[PDB]
C-alpha cells in the first residue's frame, strides 16, 4: 500500500506496525568481495525482509514487504520463494498475482525468477486460459525471447493446447522467415501432433519449406528444418529433392544449399549406392567450391570434409 | 587491433572491489562475478594482485554447512552472497539453521572453482554435504534445479552438477544415466543441443551438454559418430565473423568461447577462422575501462571479459594461459586439481 516513492513514504524502522521486529543486517565481515553499496531506503527494506525470513513469519505485512523487496531486486530467488509461501499460507487470490506478475515480466522479460513464478501460478490454478495470448504479447516485443518460447512450449505440452499453434507459427514466418525460434516451434508442434512419418504431412512440410527458400534462400533456419525432417529418413531416398535443388543452383545458391547436396551425396555413399567412384567426386567438386568461393569462413572445415569423404570411400 | 592485458587486469581488479546500488541485481550471485574476475586474473596470471587468503575466507563464509543434527543435508552447498543475514562464519563453527538458508548449484560450482584457483585445498569443504545437496537438486527428467526451494531447470545446471562432481572427484552427487538422458533428449532437429528436449538449439546449452559428457568422459559413448558429425556442423555453422548463440542471431563475444570450447572438445577447433574470431573479440575490448562486451562500442561486463579472454586463450592468444575447455578454469588450475586428487587417493 505505501508506495516506495510517496512523499509520505516512511522507513520500516520508523513504522509503528513494525516496532516489534528487530531488523537483521547483512555482514560480509572483514574483507568483502563484489560488495554492492545499498541506499538508506533499500538496506532498510532488506534489513526487515531478512528479519521476517529468519522468523518464517506468515504475516500479511510480510507479503506486502515482499512486493517492496521485489521492486528493489526482482532477481532475488529467495524473495520470490517466500512470496510464494505467503501466497499459499495467506490463501491469496492467485488471479490478483497472475496480474501483478504480467506487469513485471514486461519490464524484465529475460528475468528467470519471474518466468518461474508465472509458471508455478499456472501449475497451481491449472488455468492456461491467459497464457498463449500473454506470451504472444511478450514475443511481439522480442520474437526470439527464449524465456517466452520455453513457457509457451511448456503450456502447450502441459495442457495439450496444440490446435492453433501451427497457424501461429505460419503467421510469425510470414512476419520474419529467418526466425530460428519459430522454425523450432513449427517442428515442436508437428513432432508432438501429426508426426512426420505420414507421407502426406512430409509432402506438406518439405513443399512449405522449399517455398520459403524460393522466397529467401539465404536462411539457415529453413534449410536446417528441411534437413531436420528428412535426415533420419535418408537424404538419398528422395531423388526428386536432389534434382529440384540442382535446378536452384543457378539462381537460389547459398552455402546452405551446396552443403545440403554434399549431405545427400554422403548419405548416398553410406547407402552403398551406384557409382561410389563418381558420386564421391560430385561431393568433392562441392566441398572444394565451398572452401574456394562459396562458404570461405569455413575454408578449412569444408577442406576437412573433403579429406573425411575420401578416407571413408576409396 | 591488439590485446590490452594490463587494462584487462585493472578491470578484473575493479569487479572484485565495489559497485554502486545500480548493480543491486547481482547481490544473489556475487560469487559468479568473483569467479569471472578471479579466473579472469588467473588466466592473465595476475592473481598476485588480490588478497587470496582474505577472498578464500569470504568464499568459505558462503558455504552452507550441516547443522548440529544434520537435518539440512539436502540444502548444503554454497550461497551467492551473505544477503540472507547469517552471522559471518568462514566454515569455522558448525551449521546455523534458518528455514530459507540453502545453497545454489551455480554458487556451489563458482565457489569450488574459485577456491581451487585461489590455492586452497578444499579441506574446509564438507564434500559429502555439497554432493548430498547436489543429488537433491536432480529431477525425474535428469536435469537439475539450482535450489531445493524450486526454480527453473535446464542444461546450465546439468553442467554445474557435472563440474561439482568433477572437482570433488566424486560423481555420487548425480544420477549420470538420467543426466545423460537429459543431454541426449535435448538434441534438436538441427543437431544443436537446447536448454532441454523441445527447445531452440543454442551454443550455451550445446557447450554445457557436450562439456558435461566430456567431464563424465562419455561423449564418445553417448553420441554416434554420425551424431557428433552433425553436432560439429551445427557448432561450426555458428561462426559468421564472431560466433553467435543460435542461428540467424547476431554474434556475441561470449560464444567465441561457448561454441569455441564445444568445437575444441569435438577436436575440430583448428578448422575455424582464427583471424575473424580474434578481430571480432578484440573488436569489443573496451579501451577506456577494459574488459569486453558482447558487441563493440558497447558497455563491458565481468562475464564477457572472462569469456572474451578465454575465447582468445582457445587460439593460444599471447599473454593468456591455455583454458581447459570442458572445466572452464586455466589449464594451470586444472593441473592444480589433478594433484589435489592424486593427494586424496592414498
Ligand atoms: C541460454 O543461456 C545459456 C545457456 C547455457 C549456457 C550459457 C548460457 C548464457 C551464456 N552467456 C550469457 O551471457 C549468460 C548465460 C551464461 C551465464 N549464466 C549462468 O547461469 C551461469 O553464470 C552466471 C553459468 C556459468 C557457466 C556455465 C553456464 C552458466 C551460472 F550458472 F553460473 F549461474 C546464464 C546464461
Ligand atoms: Cl582441436
Ligand atoms: Zn554474451
GROMACS .gro file of N, CA and C in nm, chain A residues 24-39 42 50 53-56 58 72-73 75-78 81-82 84-85 112-113 116 119 142 144-146 149-150 153 178-181 183-184 187-188 218-221 224-225 227-228 231-232 256 259-260 262-263 266 295-302 304 307, chain B residues 15-21 23-28 30 33-34 54-55 58 61 79-88 98-100 104 107 147 149-154 156 188-191 194-202 205 229-230 232-234 236-241 244 246-249 268 270-273 276:
model
  471
   24UNK      N    1   1.740  -0.732   1.061
   24UNK     CA    2   1.866  -0.813   1.051
   24UNK      C    3   1.955  -0.751   0.945
   25UNK      N    4   2.079  -0.712   0.980
   25UNK     CA    5   2.170  -0.657   0.881
   25UNK      C    6   2.240  -0.774   0.812
   26UNK      N    7   2.287  -0.749   0.690
   26UNK     CA    8   2.381  -0.834   0.612
   26UNK      C    9   2.523  -0.799   0.655
   27UNK      N   10   2.614  -0.894   0.680
   27UNK     CA   11   2.758  -0.857   0.701
   27UNK      C   12   2.848  -0.960   0.631
   28UNK      N   13   2.931  -0.911   0.537
   28UNK     CA   14   3.030  -0.990   0.459
   28UNK      C   15   3.161  -0.998   0.540
   29UNK      N   16   3.164  -0.936   0.658
   29UNK     CA   17   3.280  -0.939   0.751
   29UNK      C   18   3.403  -0.872   0.690
   30UNK      N   19   3.524  -0.906   0.736
   30UNK     CA   20   3.635  -0.811   0.734
   30UNK      C   21   3.669  -0.763   0.591
   31UNK      N   22   3.707  -0.854   0.501
   31UNK     CA   23   3.718  -0.831   0.354
   31UNK      C   24   3.584  -0.867   0.294
   32UNK      N   25   3.517  -0.774   0.225
   32UNK     CA   26   3.406  -0.810   0.138
   32UNK      C   27   3.468  -0.824  -0.001
   33UNK      N   28   3.387  -0.874  -0.095
   33UNK     CA   29   3.423  -0.904  -0.237
   33UNK      C   30   3.298  -0.875  -0.319
   34UNK      N   31   3.313  -0.813  -0.436
   34UNK     CA   32   3.198  -0.768  -0.520
   34UNK      C   33   3.092  -0.712  -0.425
   35UNK      N   34   3.134  -0.623  -0.335
   35UNK     CA   35   3.038  -0.554  -0.246
   35UNK      C   36   2.951  -0.461  -0.331
   36UNK      N   37   2.822  -0.471  -0.308
   36UNK     CA   38   2.726  -0.368  -0.355
   36UNK      C   39   2.703  -0.278  -0.234
   37UNK      N   40   2.716  -0.148  -0.255
   37UNK     CA   41   2.665  -0.045  -0.161
   37UNK      C   42   2.514  -0.032  -0.186
   38UNK      N   43   2.439  -0.005  -0.079
   38UNK     CA   44   2.292  -0.004  -0.079
   38UNK      C   45   2.244   0.126  -0.013
   39UNK      N   46   2.143   0.192  -0.071
   39UNK     CA   47   2.081   0.316  -0.017
   39UNK      C   48   2.025   0.291   0.124
   42UNK      N   49   1.660   0.123   0.070
   42UNK     CA   50   1.689  -0.016   0.028
   42UNK      C   51   1.730  -0.099   0.152
   50UNK      N   52   1.499  -0.972   0.577
   50UNK     CA   53   1.579  -1.080   0.639
   50UNK      C   54   1.515  -1.122   0.771
   53UNK      N   55   1.213  -1.324   0.730
   53UNK     CA   56   1.258  -1.457   0.681
   53UNK      C   57   1.307  -1.540   0.799
   54UNK      N   58   1.420  -1.501   0.860
   54UNK     CA   59   1.476  -1.564   0.983
   54UNK      C   60   1.363  -1.632   1.059
   55UNK      N   61   1.247  -1.566   1.073
   55UNK     CA   62   1.140  -1.598   1.171
   55UNK      C   63   1.019  -1.659   1.102
   56UNK      N   64   1.040  -1.723   0.988
   56UNK     CA   65   0.937  -1.781   0.897
   56UNK      C   66   0.797  -1.717   0.912
   58UNK      N   67   0.447  -1.579   0.863
   58UNK     CA   68   0.346  -1.588   0.755
   58UNK      C   69   0.243  -1.475   0.770
   72UNK      N   70   1.285  -0.347  -0.548
   72UNK     CA   71   1.430  -0.316  -0.539
   72UNK      C   72   1.515  -0.421  -0.614
   73UNK      N   73   1.476  -0.549  -0.615
   73UNK     CA   74   1.555  -0.656  -0.682
   73UNK      C   75   1.471  -0.779  -0.714
   75UNK      N   76   1.544  -1.018  -0.881
   75UNK     CA   77   1.641  -1.124  -0.917
   75UNK      C   78   1.667  -1.215  -0.798
   76UNK      N   79   1.620  -1.169  -0.682
   76UNK     CA   80   1.633  -1.237  -0.552
   76UNK      C   81   1.537  -1.357  -0.548
   77UNK      N   82   1.587  -1.477  -0.582
   77UNK     CA   83   1.509  -1.603  -0.587
   77UNK      C   84   1.439  -1.622  -0.454
   78UNK      N   85   1.514  -1.610  -0.345
   78UNK     CA   86   1.464  -1.622  -0.205
   78UNK      C   87   1.339  -1.535  -0.187
   81UNK      N   88   1.040  -1.694  -0.367
   81UNK     CA   89   1.003  -1.820  -0.298
   81UNK      C   90   0.919  -1.788  -0.175
   82UNK      N   91   0.966  -1.696  -0.094
   82UNK     CA   92   0.898  -1.658   0.032
   82UNK      C   93   0.763  -1.593   0.000
   84UNK      N   94   0.581  -1.673  -0.258
   84UNK     CA   95   0.503  -1.792  -0.299
   84UNK      C   96   0.454  -1.867  -0.174
   85UNK      N   97   0.531  -1.866  -0.064
   85UNK     CA   98   0.492  -1.934   0.063
   85UNK      C   99   0.374  -1.858   0.123
  112UNK      N  100   1.480  -1.486  -1.513
  112UNK     CA  101   1.442  -1.628  -1.488
  112UNK      C  102   1.335  -1.637  -1.376
  113UNK      N  103   1.351  -1.560  -1.269
  113UNK     CA  104   1.272  -1.575  -1.144
  113UNK      C  105   1.126  -1.542  -1.172
  116UNK      N  106   0.953  -1.816  -1.389
  116UNK     CA  107   0.928  -1.930  -1.297
  116UNK      C  108   0.800  -1.908  -1.215
  119UNK      N  109   0.505  -1.957  -1.400
  119UNK     CA  110   0.476  -2.098  -1.433
  119UNK      C  111   0.406  -2.163  -1.315
  142UNK      N  112   0.990  -0.906  -2.832
  142UNK     CA  113   1.111  -0.985  -2.872
  142UNK      C  114   1.064  -1.121  -2.923
  144UNK      N  115   1.213  -1.361  -3.024
  144UNK     CA  116   1.321  -1.462  -3.004
  144UNK      C  117   1.356  -1.472  -2.855
  145UNK      N  118   1.266  -1.428  -2.766
  145UNK     CA  119   1.283  -1.427  -2.619
  145UNK      C  120   1.276  -1.571  -2.573
  146UNK      N  121   1.389  -1.627  -2.536
  146UNK     CA  122   1.398  -1.773  -2.510
  146UNK      C  123   1.303  -1.810  -2.396
  149UNK      N  124   0.934  -1.841  -2.534
  149UNK     CA  125   0.913  -1.968  -2.608
  149UNK      C  126   0.913  -2.087  -2.509
  150UNK      N  127   1.003  -2.089  -2.410
  150UNK     CA  128   1.015  -2.203  -2.312
  150UNK      C  129   0.877  -2.219  -2.250
  153UNK      N  130   0.598  -2.342  -2.497
  153UNK     CA  131   0.620  -2.487  -2.520
  153UNK      C  132   0.570  -2.565  -2.398
  178UNK      N  133   1.316  -1.570  -4.118
  178UNK     CA  134   1.454  -1.604  -4.077
  178UNK      C  135   1.459  -1.632  -3.925
  179UNK      N  136   1.347  -1.639  -3.855
  179UNK     CA  137   1.340  -1.653  -3.707
  179UNK      C  138   1.368  -1.798  -3.664
  180UNK      N  139   1.488  -1.833  -3.611
  180UNK     CA  140   1.519  -1.976  -3.578
  180UNK      C  141   1.419  -2.022  -3.471
  181UNK      N  142   1.373  -1.931  -3.385
  181UNK     CA  143   1.283  -1.961  -3.271
  181UNK      C  144   1.147  -2.013  -3.320
  183UNK      N  145   1.077  -2.148  -3.660
  183UNK     CA  146   1.103  -2.280  -3.726
  183UNK      C  147   1.112  -2.391  -3.620
  184UNK      N  148   1.164  -2.362  -3.500
  184UNK     CA  149   1.165  -2.461  -3.388
  184UNK      C  150   1.020  -2.488  -3.351
  187UNK      N  151   0.837  -2.741  -3.584
  187UNK     CA  152   0.872  -2.884  -3.565
  187UNK      C  153   0.822  -2.932  -3.429
  188UNK      N  154   0.832  -2.850  -3.322
  188UNK     CA  155   0.776  -2.881  -3.188
  188UNK      C  156   0.628  -2.919  -3.203
  218UNK      N  157   1.885  -1.743  -4.853
  218UNK     CA  158   1.997  -1.732  -4.757
  218UNK      C  159   1.934  -1.726  -4.619
  219UNK      N  160   1.895  -1.843  -4.569
  219UNK     CA  161   1.816  -1.857  -4.445
  219UNK      C  162   1.852  -1.993  -4.386
  220UNK      N  163   1.951  -1.995  -4.296
  220UNK     CA  164   1.997  -2.122  -4.237
  220UNK      C  165   1.873  -2.197  -4.184
  221UNK      N  166   1.779  -2.124  -4.124
  221UNK     CA  167   1.679  -2.180  -4.030
  221UNK      C  168   1.582  -2.274  -4.102
  224UNK      N  169   1.794  -2.582  -4.223
  224UNK     CA  170   1.814  -2.666  -4.102
  224UNK      C  171   1.696  -2.763  -4.089
  225UNK      N  172   1.575  -2.708  -4.106
  225UNK     CA  173   1.443  -2.775  -4.087
  225UNK      C  174   1.423  -2.877  -4.197
  227UNK      N  175   1.649  -3.028  -4.379
  227UNK     CA  176   1.741  -3.139  -4.342
  227UNK      C  177   1.682  -3.210  -4.220
  228UNK      N  178   1.647  -3.136  -4.117
  228UNK     CA  179   1.592  -3.193  -3.992
  228UNK      C  180   1.489  -3.302  -4.018
  231UNK      N  181   1.653  -3.606  -4.247
  231UNK     CA  182   1.790  -3.664  -4.242
  231UNK      C  183   1.778  -3.806  -4.187
  232UNK      N  184   1.679  -3.832  -4.103
  232UNK     CA  185   1.667  -3.964  -4.038
  232UNK      C  186   1.598  -4.062  -4.131
  256UNK      N  187   2.424  -2.301  -4.782
  256UNK     CA  188   2.323  -2.388  -4.717
  256UNK      C  189   2.275  -2.494  -4.816
  259UNK      N  190   2.598  -2.727  -4.926
  259UNK     CA  191   2.608  -2.816  -4.810
  259UNK      C  192   2.507  -2.929  -4.827
  260UNK      N  193   2.377  -2.897  -4.820
  260UNK     CA  194   2.265  -2.995  -4.832
  260UNK      C  195   2.308  -3.102  -4.930
  262UNK      N  196   2.612  -3.199  -5.061
  262UNK     CA  197   2.721  -3.281  -5.001
  262UNK      C  198   2.655  -3.389  -4.914
  263UNK      N  199   2.558  -3.349  -4.831
  263UNK     CA  200   2.497  -3.433  -4.724
  263UNK      C  201   2.409  -3.542  -4.786
  266UNK      N  202   2.675  -3.774  -4.934
  266UNK     CA  203   2.732  -3.853  -4.821
  266UNK      C  204   2.635  -3.967  -4.792
  295UNK      N  205   3.151  -2.084  -4.922
  295UNK     CA  206   3.147  -2.071  -4.774
  295UNK      C  207   3.288  -2.060  -4.719
  296UNK      N  208   3.357  -1.948  -4.745
  296UNK     CA  209   3.504  -1.931  -4.723
  296UNK      C  210   3.539  -1.926  -4.575
  297UNK      N  211   3.454  -1.865  -4.492
  297UNK     CA  212   3.483  -1.857  -4.347
  297UNK      C  213   3.493  -1.998  -4.288
  298UNK      N  214   3.444  -2.101  -4.356
  298UNK     CA  215   3.471  -2.242  -4.319
  298UNK      C  216   3.575  -2.303  -4.415
  299UNK      N  217   3.661  -2.219  -4.476
  299UNK     CA  218   3.769  -2.263  -4.571
  299UNK      C  219   3.806  -2.404  -4.522
  300UNK      N  220   3.849  -2.417  -4.397
  300UNK     CA  221   3.926  -2.537  -4.357
  300UNK      C  222   3.833  -2.647  -4.307
  301UNK      N  223   3.713  -2.611  -4.261
  301UNK     CA  224   3.614  -2.712  -4.218
  301UNK      C  225   3.579  -2.789  -4.343
  302UNK      N  226   3.541  -2.718  -4.448
  302UNK     CA  227   3.495  -2.784  -4.572
  302UNK      C  228   3.609  -2.864  -4.636
  304UNK      N  229   3.831  -3.019  -4.471
  304UNK     CA  230   3.847  -3.133  -4.378
  304UNK      C  231   3.743  -3.240  -4.412
  307UNK      N  232   3.862  -3.435  -4.705
  307UNK     CA  233   3.961  -3.538  -4.665
  307UNK      C  234   3.880  -3.653  -4.605
  329UNK      N  235   3.618  -0.523  -1.053
  329UNK     CA  236   3.499  -0.610  -1.036
  329UNK      C  237   3.494  -0.656  -0.891
  330UNK      N  238   3.600  -0.724  -0.846
  330UNK     CA  239   3.623  -0.775  -0.708
  330UNK      C  240   3.598  -0.668  -0.602
  331UNK      N  241   3.624  -0.539  -0.631
  331UNK     CA  242   3.618  -0.429  -0.531
  331UNK      C  243   3.471  -0.394  -0.506
  332UNK      N  244   3.430  -0.274  -0.539
  332UNK     CA  245   3.293  -0.230  -0.502
  332UNK      C  246   3.218  -0.187  -0.625
  333UNK      N  247   3.085  -0.194  -0.616
  333UNK     CA  248   2.994  -0.140  -0.719
  333UNK      C  249   2.880  -0.067  -0.649
  334UNK      N  250   2.819   0.030  -0.719
  334UNK     CA  251   2.703   0.104  -0.671
  334UNK      C  252   2.571   0.026  -0.668
  335UNK      N  253   2.469   0.085  -0.605
  335UNK     CA  254   2.333   0.026  -0.596
  335UNK      C  255   2.273   0.010  -0.737
  337UNK      N  256   2.388  -0.196  -0.930
  337UNK     CA  257   2.416  -0.339  -0.958
  337UNK      C  258   2.342  -0.429  -0.859
  338UNK      N  259   2.253  -0.369  -0.778
  338UNK     CA  260   2.166  -0.440  -0.681
  338UNK      C  261   2.144  -0.583  -0.731
  339UNK      N  262   2.115  -0.596  -0.861
  339UNK     CA  263   2.059  -0.720  -0.917
  339UNK      C  264   2.162  -0.833  -0.916
  340UNK      N  265   2.289  -0.806  -0.890
  340UNK     CA  266   2.393  -0.912  -0.879
  340UNK      C  267   2.402  -0.972  -0.737
  341UNK      N  268   2.329  -0.916  -0.640
  341UNK     CA  269   2.351  -0.947  -0.497
  341UNK      C  270   2.352  -1.098  -0.479
  342UNK      N  271   2.250  -1.163  -0.535
  342UNK     CA  272   2.214  -1.305  -0.514
  342UNK      C  273   2.304  -1.401  -0.593
  344UNK      N  274   2.689  -1.279  -0.645
  344UNK     CA  275   2.820  -1.211  -0.642
  344UNK      C  276   2.932  -1.313  -0.673
  347UNK      N  277   3.034  -1.354  -1.030
  347UNK     CA  278   3.118  -1.236  -1.064
  347UNK      C  279   3.260  -1.265  -1.013
  348UNK      N  280   3.273  -1.288  -0.883
  348UNK     CA  281   3.403  -1.317  -0.819
  348UNK      C  282   3.482  -1.412  -0.910
  368UNK      N  283   4.225  -1.374   0.206
  368UNK     CA  284   4.106  -1.297   0.254
  368UNK      C  285   3.982  -1.324   0.169
  369UNK      N  286   4.002  -1.350   0.040
  369UNK     CA  287   3.895  -1.395  -0.052
  369UNK      C  288   3.856  -1.539  -0.014
  372UNK      N  289   3.617  -1.516   0.254
  372UNK     CA  290   3.485  -1.473   0.202
  372UNK      C  291   3.414  -1.594   0.141
  375UNK      N  292   3.288  -1.840   0.391
  375UNK     CA  293   3.179  -1.773   0.466
  375UNK      C  294   3.047  -1.807   0.398
  393UNK      N  295   2.622  -2.042  -0.090
  393UNK     CA  296   2.534  -1.925  -0.117
  393UNK      C  297   2.599  -1.832  -0.221
  394UNK      N  298   2.519  -1.760  -0.302
  394UNK     CA  299   2.564  -1.649  -0.390
  394UNK      C  300   2.645  -1.544  -0.313
  395UNK      N  301   2.604  -1.514  -0.190
  395UNK     CA  302   2.646  -1.399  -0.105
  395UNK      C  303   2.586  -1.411   0.036
  396UNK      N  304   2.611  -1.314   0.123
  396UNK     CA  305   2.563  -1.319   0.263
  396UNK      C  306   2.421  -1.263   0.275
  397UNK      N  307   2.358  -1.222   0.164
  397UNK     CA  308   2.230  -1.145   0.159
  397UNK      C  309   2.120  -1.202   0.249
  398UNK      N  310   2.131  -1.325   0.298
  398UNK     CA  311   2.027  -1.381   0.387
  398UNK      C  312   2.039  -1.325   0.529
  399UNK      N  313   2.156  -1.275   0.568
  399UNK     CA  314   2.178  -1.216   0.702
  399UNK      C  315   2.219  -1.321   0.804
  400UNK      N  316   2.308  -1.410   0.764
  400UNK     CA  317   2.364  -1.510   0.858
  400UNK      C  318   2.491  -1.452   0.919
  401UNK      N  319   2.517  -1.472   1.049
  401UNK     CA  320   2.647  -1.435   1.105
  401UNK      C  321   2.767  -1.489   1.024
  402UNK      N  322   2.861  -1.400   0.986
  402UNK     CA  323   2.986  -1.433   0.911
  402UNK      C  324   3.061  -1.545   0.983
  412UNK      N  325   1.808  -2.215   0.983
  412UNK     CA  326   1.742  -2.100   0.918
  412UNK      C  327   1.647  -2.161   0.817
  413UNK      N  328   1.516  -2.133   0.821
  413UNK     CA  329   1.422  -2.202   0.734
  413UNK      C  330   1.468  -2.197   0.587
  414UNK      N  331   1.507  -2.079   0.542
  414UNK     CA  332   1.518  -2.049   0.398
  414UNK      C  333   1.664  -2.059   0.354
  418UNK      N  334   2.308  -2.311  -0.369
  418UNK     CA  335   2.266  -2.283  -0.508
  418UNK      C  336   2.369  -2.346  -0.601
  421UNK      N  337   2.646  -2.159  -0.749
  421UNK     CA  338   2.737  -2.099  -0.648
  421UNK      C  339   2.827  -2.209  -0.592
  461UNK      N  340   1.827  -2.475  -0.667
  461UNK     CA  341   1.795  -2.463  -0.523
  461UNK      C  342   1.686  -2.564  -0.489
  463UNK      N  343   1.441  -2.521  -0.301
  463UNK     CA  344   1.314  -2.445  -0.283
  463UNK      C  345   1.231  -2.448  -0.413
  464UNK      N  346   1.287  -2.499  -0.524
  464UNK     CA  347   1.229  -2.495  -0.660
  464UNK      C  348   1.289  -2.382  -0.742
  465UNK      N  349   1.292  -2.398  -0.874
  465UNK     CA  350   1.348  -2.298  -0.969
  465UNK      C  351   1.339  -2.353  -1.112
  466UNK      N  352   1.372  -2.271  -1.210
  466UNK     CA  353   1.399  -2.320  -1.347
  466UNK      C  354   1.493  -2.441  -1.334
  467UNK      N  355   1.477  -2.539  -1.424
  467UNK     CA  356   1.576  -2.647  -1.453
  467UNK      C  357   1.613  -2.637  -1.601
  468UNK      N  358   1.728  -2.693  -1.640
  468UNK     CA  359   1.787  -2.689  -1.778
  468UNK      C  360   1.938  -2.718  -1.778
  470UNK      N  361   2.215  -2.578  -1.812
  470UNK     CA  362   2.315  -2.497  -1.738
  470UNK      C  363   2.358  -2.575  -1.614
  502UNK      N  364   1.836  -3.130  -3.098
  502UNK     CA  365   1.728  -3.065  -3.178
  502UNK      C  366   1.723  -3.129  -3.316
  503UNK      N  367   1.620  -3.092  -3.393
  503UNK     CA  368   1.604  -3.124  -3.537
  503UNK      C  369   1.723  -3.063  -3.613
  504UNK      N  370   1.794  -2.964  -3.558
  504UNK     CA  371   1.910  -2.907  -3.632
  504UNK      C  372   2.039  -2.959  -3.570
  505UNK      N  373   2.032  -3.064  -3.487
  505UNK     CA  374   2.152  -3.134  -3.433
  505UNK      C  375   2.234  -3.049  -3.332
  508UNK      N  376   1.984  -2.799  -2.685
  508UNK     CA  377   1.893  -2.694  -2.635
  508UNK      C  378   1.888  -2.701  -2.483
  509UNK      N  379   1.824  -2.603  -2.421
  509UNK     CA  380   1.814  -2.596  -2.274
  509UNK      C  381   1.754  -2.725  -2.219
  510UNK      N  382   1.667  -2.786  -2.298
  510UNK     CA  383   1.605  -2.915  -2.266
  510UNK      C  384   1.520  -2.960  -2.382
  511UNK      N  385   1.505  -3.092  -2.398
  511UNK     CA  386   1.427  -3.151  -2.509
  511UNK      C  387   1.310  -3.058  -2.544
  512UNK      N  388   1.291  -3.032  -2.674
  512UNK     CA  389   1.187  -2.941  -2.729
  512UNK      C  390   1.246  -2.813  -2.788
  513UNK      N  391   1.323  -2.743  -2.706
  513UNK     CA  392   1.355  -2.601  -2.726
  513UNK      C  393   1.452  -2.578  -2.843
  514UNK      N  394   1.476  -2.450  -2.870
  514UNK     CA  395   1.576  -2.398  -2.966
  514UNK      C  396   1.712  -2.455  -2.925
  515UNK      N  397   1.782  -2.518  -3.020
  515UNK     CA  398   1.929  -2.540  -3.020
  515UNK      C  399   1.996  -2.410  -2.975
  516UNK      N  400   2.108  -2.415  -2.904
  516UNK     CA  401   2.173  -2.292  -2.851
  516UNK      C  402   2.315  -2.322  -2.805
  519UNK      N  403   2.373  -2.388  -2.416
  519UNK     CA  404   2.321  -2.526  -2.396
  519UNK      C  405   2.420  -2.626  -2.457
  543UNK      N  406   2.920  -3.581  -3.571
  543UNK     CA  407   2.944  -3.516  -3.703
  543UNK      C  408   2.839  -3.406  -3.725
  544UNK      N  409   2.711  -3.437  -3.709
  544UNK     CA  410   2.600  -3.339  -3.722
  544UNK      C  411   2.612  -3.227  -3.618
  546UNK      N  412   2.893  -3.121  -3.484
  546UNK     CA  413   3.010  -3.038  -3.517
  546UNK      C  414   2.967  -2.934  -3.620
  547UNK      N  415   2.897  -2.980  -3.724
  547UNK     CA  416   2.841  -2.889  -3.828
  547UNK      C  417   2.763  -2.778  -3.758
  548UNK      N  418   2.667  -2.813  -3.673
  548UNK     CA  419   2.582  -2.710  -3.609
  548UNK      C  420   2.671  -2.602  -3.549
  550UNK      N  421   3.008  -2.529  -3.588
  550UNK     CA  422   3.099  -2.452  -3.679
  550UNK      C  423   3.016  -2.361  -3.769
  551UNK      N  424   2.890  -2.394  -3.794
  551UNK     CA  425   2.799  -2.305  -3.870
  551UNK      C  426   2.760  -2.184  -3.785
  552UNK      N  427   2.808  -2.174  -3.661
  552UNK     CA  428   2.775  -2.059  -3.575
  552UNK      C  429   2.869  -1.944  -3.605
  553UNK      N  430   2.981  -1.968  -3.673
  553UNK     CA  431   3.078  -1.859  -3.698
  553UNK      C  432   3.032  -1.778  -3.819
  554UNK      N  433   3.014  -1.647  -3.800
  554UNK     CA  434   2.980  -1.552  -3.910
  554UNK      C  435   3.102  -1.460  -3.929
  555UNK      N  436   3.162  -1.421  -3.816
  555UNK     CA  437   3.284  -1.336  -3.801
  555UNK      C  438   3.328  -1.365  -3.657
  558UNK      N  439   2.784  -1.657  -3.293
  558UNK     CA  440   2.651  -1.623  -3.234
  558UNK      C  441   2.598  -1.743  -3.155
  560UNK      N  442   2.280  -1.873  -3.145
  560UNK     CA  443   2.186  -1.959  -3.220
  560UNK      C  444   2.159  -1.900  -3.357
  561UNK      N  445   2.123  -1.984  -3.456
  561UNK     CA  446   2.130  -1.940  -3.595
  561UNK      C  447   2.043  -1.815  -3.618
  562UNK      N  448   2.083  -1.735  -3.715
  562UNK     CA  449   2.013  -1.610  -3.755
  562UNK      C  450   2.007  -1.516  -3.635
  563UNK      N  451   2.106  -1.523  -3.546
  563UNK     CA  452   2.123  -1.423  -3.438
  563UNK      C  453   2.261  -1.360  -3.451
  582UNK      N  454   3.798  -3.013  -3.345
  582UNK     CA  455   3.796  -2.952  -3.482
  582UNK      C  456   3.804  -2.801  -3.468
  584UNK      N  457   4.051  -2.614  -3.470
  584UNK     CA  458   4.152  -2.586  -3.574
  584UNK      C  459   4.090  -2.549  -3.710
  585UNK      N  460   3.971  -2.597  -3.742
  585UNK     CA  461   3.917  -2.575  -3.878
  585UNK      C  462   3.833  -2.447  -3.879
  586UNK      N  463   3.823  -2.376  -3.766
  586UNK     CA  464   3.758  -2.242  -3.763
  586UNK      C  465   3.850  -2.137  -3.824
  587UNK      N  466   3.791  -2.023  -3.856
  587UNK     CA  467   3.862  -1.897  -3.885
  587UNK      C  468   3.907  -1.836  -3.752
  590UNK      N  469   3.917  -1.391  -3.792
  590UNK     CA  470   3.790  -1.315  -3.779
  590UNK      C  471   3.740  -1.325  -3.634
   0.00000   0.00000   0.00000
